[PDB]
Amino acid sequence: IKNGNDRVAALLVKEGATLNIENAGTFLCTVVAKGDSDFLKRLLSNGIDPNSKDYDHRTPLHVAASEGFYVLAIQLVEASANVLAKDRWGNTPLDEALGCGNKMLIKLLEDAKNSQISS
Amino acid sequence: IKNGNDRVAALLVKEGATLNIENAGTFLCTVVAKGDSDFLKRLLSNGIDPNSKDYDHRTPLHVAASEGFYVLAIQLVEASANVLAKDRWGNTPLDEALGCGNKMLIKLLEDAKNSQISS
Amino acid sequence: IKNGNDRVAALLVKEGATLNIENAGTFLCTVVAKGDSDFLKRLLSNGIDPNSKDYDHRTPLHVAASEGFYVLAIQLVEASANVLAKDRWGNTPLDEALGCGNKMLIKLLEDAKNSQISS
User: Nearest CA to CA, how far is B64 from chain C (Å)?
Assistant: First the structure.
């Protein structure tokens, strides 16, 4: 995946390939920090769980809201990985999105959270 | 350092060597999550920064103090680690240790706070 | 174990070896005094008794809990160490940990006490 050769990965997943990595929550949290949107798109194509949390119990929804990224959050919201999960500090990702700002993306995040809460 | 070969590690220090790891703050706070002490004790002997910030600007002192690591906290402050730091939301490591609740850690944090005040 | 050569240590275990040290209780409780975590962890892998009594009939759990060693306490109880022990004057390790004062240690001691009650 990191080499950009997704064609080979199709054969592997057809044979029963599983993407298991230690401390996946930390790995899935630092990818959005670098802004590698293309790299992140291939990750969810492998069926990896996006609800993993780091040592501080922070889902990728928390960092995406704090980072103020709209494109990354839109793809992450499509994965449907929780709506509002309390962290060690006790702050829900929805609350972090409102505090961070970005009303253009805050409304989209709120609508995505409302849709997730409705389901 | 990974295999504990301090004899070989000390040779490189004399001949000239340093630790160049991507996401030093993120990597260092992950080590303290497991709880190993000897692995990171020799790391500080190679000149690694103990105050490196993670993606959430969280010092390893915050990780050690919040979970309840005590023997590791004194090791970190032995490397002149800052104690008046703040997190992304805003919280001092001494306040975080006091918030969790530990008489022994509060006294150690107060001593660290006194050292910072004395400077 | 002294030099950390676990590779050589594991060979002796397979070929047949054991630790025969005079005053095992006195020696073991001295290990936790300095606070090294890697040294005593491999000791339990060789079958050393974690409940060996010292000259004052003090278990290593009492030494770790009284001073405030938390990461070592979970290591000792991982070797099926007794938690309802008594000292020469008479004091449970859970009571000693509670007497010193530690919210994290009290919960761990209560969990250890629950395991002893469940048996």
Answer: 11
